Design a binder for this molecule. Structure first.
Ligand SMILES: O=C(NCc1cccnc1)c1cc(-c2csc3c(=O)cc(N4CCOCC4)oc23)cc2c1OCCO2
Length: 127
């Protein structure tokens, strides 16, 4: 297994906005509760799951585990930077697997709730 994505770097300033606040307090909470959240709450263990080509195909892995630690350490500059990590987490499941698989359908159901909940983030960002 490779190192997981890092959740803080001492050279990057820390910034919090009202949207990043609502993103960890509400959206993540709902997404972490979903029925199909358990395969995406931590970095994929390609060894125990016997996926030897996973990290050779997925060059930018992502999970809600690291997304949460990034919201907590203020790794993200704005809300856009966080939303981009969910899209990449979803598309990873779509790139590595084939259409119509179960894990694909679990990520699709999990994405439809994500796009629904981020429509609740404040339309005007406040620092
Ligand atoms: O397969 C899983 N659970 C059932 C199980 C059965 C037997 C032994 N061990 C576990 C599983 C999959 C992902 C997970 C998150 S993203 C992602 C992906 O993109 C492709 C795969 N695959 C490909 C083929 O299907 C099985 C595993 O898995 C994942 C994350 C997980 C999983 O279970 C344990 C913890 O987190």
């Amino acid at each position: 297994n490779p190192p997981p994505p890092e959740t803080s770097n001492p050279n990057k300033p820390k910034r919090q906005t009202n949207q990043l606040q609502y993103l960890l307090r509400v959206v993540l909470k709902t997404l972490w509760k979903h029925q199909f959240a358990w395969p995406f709450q931590q970095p994929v263990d390609a060894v125990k799951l016997n996926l030897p080509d996973y990290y050779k195909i997925i060059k930018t892995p992502m999970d809600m585990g690291t997304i949460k630690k990034r919201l907590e350490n203020n790794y993200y500059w704005n809300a856009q930077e966080c939303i981009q990590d969910f899209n990449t987490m979803f598309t990873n499941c779509y790139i590595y697997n084939k259409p119509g698989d179960d894990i694909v359908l679990m990520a699709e159901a999990l994405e439809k709730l994500f796009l629904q909940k981020i429509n609740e983030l404040p339309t005007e960002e406040t620092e």
